[PDB]
């Protein structure tokens, strides 16, 4: 009868960390991903990996 | 306490007639067997807690620790009596059983034995 107690508190914080993690994931991703694209150099990196396709596809 | 070692001759048990109890005996046997089956099962020990594990892991914390010492510290009475006139409602009715009816009954028995002597003449 005692333990259910304790276990809830843990389970809450575990669930709370996941509902942070989801809200974090969505918000963090939704904040810091929009701005990135000013890198034309993410396409120099597309370019880079693409030369490592065009080269490294042999 | 532990277990009580009373052996019950169920043959003899139901038979009794202190008449307010003969019916009771018939019921009390079966009332017993209900209790008998119950105790004979019950798991002797329950578990206890890895306090250290939950001590970490409960983070409304110190709860497990508080509980740890307090649970390890928390103690328990042991369940009351009701009806233990039996120890006594025995021995006195036992004097009726045995001695009082015994001795009288032997007194009867002897006269026939003495008279079967006589009838041997």
From Swiss-Prot, chain A:
Disulfide bonds: none
Domain of life: Eukaryota
Location in or out of the cell: Mitochondrion; Mitochondrion inner membrane
Modification type N6-acetyllysine: residues: 30, 42, 53
Quaternary context: Component of the ATP synthase complex composed at least of ATP5F1A/subunit alpha, ATP5F1B/subunit beta, ATP5MC1/subunit c (homooctomer), MT-ATP6/subunit a, MT-ATP8/subunit 8, ATP5ME/subunit e, ATP5MF/subunit f, ATP5MG/subunit g, ATP5MK/subunit k, ATP5MJ/subunit j, ATP5F1C/subunit gamma, ATP5F1D/subunit delta, ATP5F1E/subunit epsilon, ATP5PF/subunit F6, ATP5PB/subunit b, ATP5PD/subunit d, ATP5PO/subunit OSCP.
Family statement: Belongs to the eukaryotic ATPase B chain family.
Function: Subunit b, of the mitochondrial membrane ATP synthase complex (F(1)F(0) ATP synthase or Complex V) that produces ATP from ADP in the presence of a proton gradient across the membrane which is generated by electron transport complexes of the respiratory chain. ATP synthase complex consist of a soluble F(1) head domain - the catalytic core - and a membrane F(1) domain - the membrane proton channel. These two domains are linked by a central stalk rotating inside the F(1) region and a stationary peripheral stalk.
UniProt name for this protein: ATP synthase peripheral stalk subunit b, mitochondrial
Species annotation: Bos taurus (Bovine)
Gene (name only): ATP5PB
Residue numbers of the full-length protein present here: 192 to 249 of 256
UniProtKB/Swiss-Prot annotation, chain B:
Any one GO molecular-function label of the UniProt entry: proton-transporting ATP synthase activity, rotational mechanism
Residues carrying N6-acetyllysine: 29, 45, 60, 69, 75, 82, 92, 114
Disulfide bridges in this chain: none
Biological-process GO terms, alphabetical: proton motive force-driven ATP synthesis; proton motive force-driven mitochondrial ATP synthesis
Regions annotated as coiled coil: none
Family, similarity comment: Belongs to the ATPase d subunit family.
Assembly information from the UniProt record: Component of the ATP synthase complex composed at least of ATP5F1A/subunit alpha, ATP5F1B/subunit beta, ATP5MC1/subunit c (homooctomer), MT-ATP6/subunit a, MT-ATP8/subunit 8, ATP5ME/subunit e, ATP5MF/subunit f, ATP5MG/subunit g, ATP5MK/subunit k, ATP5MJ/subunit j, ATP5F1C/subunit gamma, ATP5F1D/subunit delta, ATP5F1E/subunit epsilon, ATP5PF/subunit F6, ATP5PB/subunit b, ATP5PD/subunit d, ATP5PO/subunit OSCP.
Protein name (record): ATP synthase peripheral stalk subunit d, mitochondrial
Source species: Bos taurus (Bovine)
Lineage, broadest ranks: Eukaryota, Metazoa, Chordata, Craniata, Vertebrata
Gene: ATP5PD
Section of the entire sequence shown: 4 to 124 of 161
């Amino acid at each position: 009868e005692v333990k259910n107690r304790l276990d809830y508190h843990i389970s809450v914080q575990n669930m709370m960390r996941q509902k942070e993690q989801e809200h974090m994931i969505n918000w963090v991703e939704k904040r810091v991903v929009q701005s990135i694209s000013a890198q034309q150099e993410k396409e120099t990196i597309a370019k880079c990996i693409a030369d490592l396709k065009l080269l490294s596809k042999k | 306490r532990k277990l009580a070692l009373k052996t019950i001759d169920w043959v003899a048990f139901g038979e009794i007639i202190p008449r307010n109890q003969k019916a009771v005996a018939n019921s009390l046997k079966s009332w017993n067997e209900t209790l008998t089956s119950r105790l004979a099962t019950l798991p002797e020990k329950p578990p206890a807690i890895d306090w250290a594990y939950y001590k970490a892991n409960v983070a409304k914390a110190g709860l497990v620790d508080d509980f740890e010492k307090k649970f390890n510290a928390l103690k328990v009475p042991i369940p009351e009596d009701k009806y233990t006139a039996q120890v006594d409602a025995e021995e006195k009715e036992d004097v009726k059983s045995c001695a009082e009816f015994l001795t009288q009954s032997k007194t009867r028995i002897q006269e026939y034995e003495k008279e079967l002597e006589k009838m041997r003449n």
